[PDB]
Amino acid sequence: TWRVSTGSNVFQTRAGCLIGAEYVNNSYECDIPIGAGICASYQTQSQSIIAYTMSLGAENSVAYSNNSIAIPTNFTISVTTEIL
Amino acid sequence: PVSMTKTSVDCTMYICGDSTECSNLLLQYGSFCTQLKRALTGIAVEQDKNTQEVFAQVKQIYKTPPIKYFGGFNFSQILPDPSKPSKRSFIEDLLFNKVTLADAGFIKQDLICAQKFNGLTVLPPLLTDEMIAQYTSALLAGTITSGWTFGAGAALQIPFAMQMAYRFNGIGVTQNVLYENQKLIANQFNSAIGKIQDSLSSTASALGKLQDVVNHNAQALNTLVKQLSSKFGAISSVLNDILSRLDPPEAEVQIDRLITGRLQSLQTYVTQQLIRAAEIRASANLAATKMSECVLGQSKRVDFCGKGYHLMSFPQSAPHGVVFLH
Amino acid sequence: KLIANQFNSAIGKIQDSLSSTASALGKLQDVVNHNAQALNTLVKQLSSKFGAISSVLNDILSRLDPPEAEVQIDRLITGRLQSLQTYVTQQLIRAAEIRASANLAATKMSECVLGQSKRVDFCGKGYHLMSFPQSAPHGVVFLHVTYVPAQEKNFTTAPAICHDGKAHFPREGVFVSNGTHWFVTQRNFYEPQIITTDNTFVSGNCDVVIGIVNNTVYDPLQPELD
Numbered sequence: 128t129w130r131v132s133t134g135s136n137v138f139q140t141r142a143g144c145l146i147g148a149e150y151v152n153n154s155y156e157c158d159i160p161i162g163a164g165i166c167a168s169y170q171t172q173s174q175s176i177i178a179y180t181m182s183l184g185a186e187n188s189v190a191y192s193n194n195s196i197a198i199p200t201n202f203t204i205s206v207t208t209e210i211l
Numbered sequence: 212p213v214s215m216t217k218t219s220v221d222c223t224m225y226i227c228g229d230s231t232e233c234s235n236l237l238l239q240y241g242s243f244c245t246q247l248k249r250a251l252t253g254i255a256v257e258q259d260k261n262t263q264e265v266f267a268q269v270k271q272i273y274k275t276p277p278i279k280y281f282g283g284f285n286f287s288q289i290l291p292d293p294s295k296p297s298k299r300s301f302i303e304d305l306l307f308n309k310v311t312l313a314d315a316g317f318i319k320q321d322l323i324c325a326q327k328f329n330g331l332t333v334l335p336p337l338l339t340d341e342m343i344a345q346y347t348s349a350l351l352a353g354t355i356t357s358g359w360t361f362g363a364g365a366a367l368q369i370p371f372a373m374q375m376a377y378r379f380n381g382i383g384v385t386q387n388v389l390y391e392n393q394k395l396i397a398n399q400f401n402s403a404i405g406k407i408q409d410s411l412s413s414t415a416s417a418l419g420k421l422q423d424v425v426n427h428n429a430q431a432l433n434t435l436v437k438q439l440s441s442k443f444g445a446i447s448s449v450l451n452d453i454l455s456r457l458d459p460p461e462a463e464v465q466i467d468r469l470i471t472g473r474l475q476s477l478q479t480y481v482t483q484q485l486i487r488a489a490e491i492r493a494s495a496n497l498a499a500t501k502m503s504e505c506v507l508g509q510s511k512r513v514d515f516c517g518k519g520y521h522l523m524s525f526p527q528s529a530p531h532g533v534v535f536l537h
Numbered sequence: 538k539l540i541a542n543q544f545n546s547a548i549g550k551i552q553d554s555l556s557s558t559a560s561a562l563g564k565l566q567d568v569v570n571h572n573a574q575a576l577n578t579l580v581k582q583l584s585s586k587f588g589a590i591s592s593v594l595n596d597i598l599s600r601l602d603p604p605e606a607e608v609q610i611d612r613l614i615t616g617r618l619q620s621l622q623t624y625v626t627q628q629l630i631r632a633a634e635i636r637a638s639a640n641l642a643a644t645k646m647s648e649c650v651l652g653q654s655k656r657v658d659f660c661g662k663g664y665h666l667m668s669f670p671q672s673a674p675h676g677v678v679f680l681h682v683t684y685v686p687a688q689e690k691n692f693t694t695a696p697a698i699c700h701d702g703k704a705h706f707p708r709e710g711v712f713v714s715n716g717t718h719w720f721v722t723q724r725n726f727y728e729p730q731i732i733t734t735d736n737t738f739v740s741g742n743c744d745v746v747i748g749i750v751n752n753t754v755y756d757p758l759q760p761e762l763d
């Protein structure tokens with residue numbers, strides 16, 4: 128019996144129809160998964176709920192060549208935790 | 212195979228429908244519906260976890276240089292094809308065509324109509340095919356252009372011939388053997404890749420373990436739908452007829468049997484789904500281990516990354532699973 | 538000393554992170570929550586009627602004669618049996634996963650703590666050096682100690698050297714150039730050295746390998762003699 132304000136932002140996704148969130152062109156890490164590559168979050172604009180397409184990672188291009196190599200000159204010691 | 216289909220069920224709509232007396236009677240049977248919902252939701256989330264843990268091994272999205280010369284090795288049939296909108300490769304396109312699904316749970320504005328009208332629905336995966344293709348392309352580019360150094364730190368470039376010399380030296384054969392037989396090795400590799408392509412394109416029908424998942428899920432759903440035509444010892448199988456022909460005191464007696472039968476059917480379906488999800492999870496774990504140990508490095512485990520002395524491995528994606536070329 | 542300081546700093550960082558509400562033991566809390574929820578649901582299920590006239594056995598006995606009491610009690614018996622069976626089956630299914638996790642943990646204890654493993658990303662990220670175990674309620678925590686390269690530099694390289702119409706390859710390492718001179722270095726750490734007959738081996742001539750160079754190779758015996 129409750130009615131959601133249909134005059135607010137309405138968005139169409141392959142999962143269905145999303146009401147109450149505005150689509151933005153930025154890409155962040157997924158926070159609340161909606162589906163079909165669409166996630167949502169609560170961000171400061173004022174504060175509001177936004178929907179976006181999740182990102183996979185930053186781009187990178189290796190400088191390949193016929194006779195070019197890269198050799199490390201220093202090292203680091205890492206200690207990580209695993210729980211089972 | 213890594214993942215299976217994600218399904219959800221509306222218990223009240225399946226058992227009762229639009230009837231109100233049936234729902235009122237069902238209100239007295241406790242909290243079975245909530246348990247079924249929780250189980251199916253757990254399965255659905257587990258599937259996305261499997262896919263993410265298998266295909267998300269790479270920190271950054273690597274790229275291949277504009278010039279494609281890697282010591283005579285072609286790599287044309289496995290790198291992305293810019294012409295296609297999905298940016299898949301030739302082999303990936305063949306794999307996608309080979310396996311046919313039923314539906315990915317998109318907008319639905321037959322058998323699927325019956326399933327929908329009785330409260331059984333399918334949800335879409337969290338990652339679309341394009342994202343998985345991007346992940347695979349990044350992994351392949353890193354492997355080709357940096358060797359195994361991109362999996363233990365930051366990617367460091369090295370020409371492909373010297374990388375092959377490293378990998379030859381890693382199996383007890385000196386590198387001067389490779390440096391003196393480069394063209395023959397390149398020709399053999401190109402011929403092998405072409406032979407794989409020809410075999411797969413000429414109706415290999417080797418993707419059965421991926422069709423089995425789809426067939427089993429569809430058959431289970433069809434059985435659940437067809438289960439609604441039974442009587443379970445009642446006068447009829449339609450609640451409207453029972454309400455029309457009998458007074459409430461007898462209608463309740465007749466409806467209890469239908470409620471119990473429908474609940475039993477749902478419970479058996481959910482239990483079987485759990486048991487299948489277990490083995491799918493085990494297979495996904497094996498696939499993740501293979502991805503981490505065969506393509507990101509060179510393994511000395513016998514017959515783990517192929518038959519013979521392991522040299523390299525390349526991944527490819529396919530509907531609901533992965534393919535390795537060793 | 539540098540490695541000791543880095544190890545101590547990493548351990549201190551782990552301690553600091555774990556002290557101030559790390560909340561990283563979700564996997565060990567999920568088991569407790571699931572078991573508690575299962576038991577609570579099993580207890581709550583006792584208040585259903587299952588189509589009878591009442592959910593209390595004493596009330597049914599009091600309000601009806603035995604012939605009707607039996608037919609009213611059969612329904613409760615059936616429902617409660619069904620609930621218990623569901624609980625048992627779900628417990629079986631969960632125990633299977635717990636056993637799988639225990640087997641994985643045992644294998645990891647054998648291969649990462651009692652030795653050094655070459656399996657990639659099995660005993661941590663990077664190249665494995667060591668691992669230490671710790672206990673926790675219904676679980677185990679592994680501290681993996683690994684070695685990570687850093688601060689890379691760019692060089693020119695060749696597959697083989699040519700000298701006296703002979704092709705020389707490095708016994709273990711690569712040839713690198715800083716612009717005017719050629720050295721031989723190990724792969725994981727930059728440490729250039731002079732190319733000599735001690736750290737290279739010869740096989741063939743200079744007209745088969747693709748990309749050789751003309752640089753010189755030093756021999757110690759002749760300078761040693763005179």
Ligand SMILES: *[C@@H]1O[C@H](CO)[C@@H](O)[C@H](O)[C@H]1NC(C)=O
Binds near residue numbers: 192193278280
């Ligand atoms: C590398 O060598 C090949 C073989 O001669 C040549 O075709 C290519 O232009 C060279 N440069 C690059 C960047 O590959």
Ligand SMILES: *[C@@H]1O[C@H](CO)[C@@H](O)[C@H](O)[C@H]1NC(C)=O
Binds near residue numbers: 201202
């Ligand atoms: C290597 O890195 C460490 C970082 O703690 C630094 O102190 C040291 O000076 C570096 N070594 C060289 C040769 O730059």
Ligand SMILES: *[C@@H]1O[C@H](CO)[C@@H](O)[C@H](O)[C@H]1NC(C)=O
Binds near residue numbers: 285286287405
């Ligand atoms: C790679 O293979 C394709 C088809 O097999 C061929 O058209 C192409 O010419 C090959 N690459 C090169 C560099 O010849």
Ligand SMILES: *[C@@H]1O[C@H](CO)[C@@H](O)[C@H](O)[C@H]1NC(C)=O
Binds near residue numbers: 716718
């Ligand atoms: C290369 O290293 C040698 C060391 O013998 C040095 O004399 C020379 O100046 C270096 N060239 C450079 C840095 O361009």
Ligand SMILES: *[C@@H]1O[C@H](CO)[C@@H](O)[C@H](O)[C@H]1NC(C)=O
Binds near residue numbers: 751
């Ligand atoms: C130097 O290289 C040339 C061709 O690159 C070759 O003919 C000659 O034998 C090499 N050695 C010399 C000039 O000492």
